[PDB]
Design a protein around this ligand. Structure first.
Ligand code: ZN
Length: 305
């Protein structure tokens, strides 16, 4: 059984006509997951409404009250642009709180069932910092979910693995100070947002940045996974793995310069299965629609058998 957490309200985060972070990204994925041979093994879940679980007691662990206030106020005044690349529609604050709630649900569900969970959310989260949204990101979904998980019985350690093509500067900033969390990122260098050097390990030796030259494909990523990533995660022995699952390191993705194929994410998930803990995937980037759908399918296929 594979758990998908999805609401059509995630489609209501409005980014504009030709913005690459589009609502269709979700439809494209959903259609593919419903078309696959093992579709009857997917259980769909609607995320907990924010009227029932207010996520702010966890959002506020990470983000400034001033930032939260200003974001909500931009949304409720009719929308706008937080920066040139990061639109906010009237629904966007509520939609981002629901995306947090979907990840919180995913933590709950992964812990309860020991089965994989994919939070099919917009907006993405891994660039959002304590005090501002950026790079299409409003709130730090995965870092917030990790902090939520640490409040739960049986979770004393969380590992985050970010395979979005871009460094998760927000995630890193938000979890670096926390000895209960480790963060591992594989990312293109040079690429947006110009952060993550390999020598930055945080004061807790809990940050492992793996920058890679443009043009990387399956071979170099698999080498890093077997030689660097899984030894690091395994020595820490986390009670939960949260994967920032972005799919923009693919050859066909328009925003970046790596050359992965959809089927490579199957290998990445197989590596992650070597860990004994449960796994929550949370959608980040990935912008070519067909490639993105095929890549989510590949990500979850190793769990179908
Ligand atoms: Zn990205």
């Amino acid at each position: 059984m594979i758990h998908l957490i999805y609401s059509d309200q995630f489609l209501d985060h409005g980014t504009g006509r030709s913005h690459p972070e589009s609502a269709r990204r979700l439809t494209a994925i959903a259609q593919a997951l419903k078309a696959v041979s093992w579709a009857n093994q997917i259980q769909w879940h609607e995320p907990t409404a924010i009227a029932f679980r207010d996520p702010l007691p966890w959002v506020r662990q990470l983000h400034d009250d001033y930032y939260l206030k200003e974001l909500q106020k931009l949304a409720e005044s009719g929308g706008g642009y937080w920066d040139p690349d990061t639109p906010v529609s009237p629904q966007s604050f509520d939609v981002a709180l629901l995306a947090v709630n979907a990840c919180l649900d995913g933590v709950d569900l992964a812990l309860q069932t020991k089965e994989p969970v994919f939070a099919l959310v917009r907006p993405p989260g891994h660039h959002a910092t304590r005090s501002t949204g950026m790079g299409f990101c409003l709130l730090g979904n995965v870092a917030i979910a990790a902090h939520y998980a640490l409040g739960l019985a049986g979770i004393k350690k969380v590992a985050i693995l970010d395979w979005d093509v871009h460094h998760g500067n927000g995630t890193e900033y938000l979890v670096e100070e926390n000895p209960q969390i480790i963060y591992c990122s594989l990312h293109q260098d040079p690429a947006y947002p110009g952060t993550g050097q390999a020598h930055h390990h945080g004061r807790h030796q809990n940050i492992l940045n793996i920058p890679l030259k443009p043009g990387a494909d399956r071979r170099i990523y698999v080498q890093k996974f077997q030689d660097v990533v899984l030894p690091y995660l395994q020595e820490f022995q986390p009670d939960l793995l949260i994967v920032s699952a972005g799919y923009d390191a693919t050859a066909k993705d328009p925003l970046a310069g790596m050359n992965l194929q959809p089927q490579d994410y199957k290998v990445f998930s197989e590596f992650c299965q070597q860990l004994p803990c449960p796994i929550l995937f949370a959608l980040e980037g990935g912008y070519h629609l067909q490639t993105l759908a095929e890549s989510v399918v590949a990500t979850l296929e190793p769990f179908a058998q």
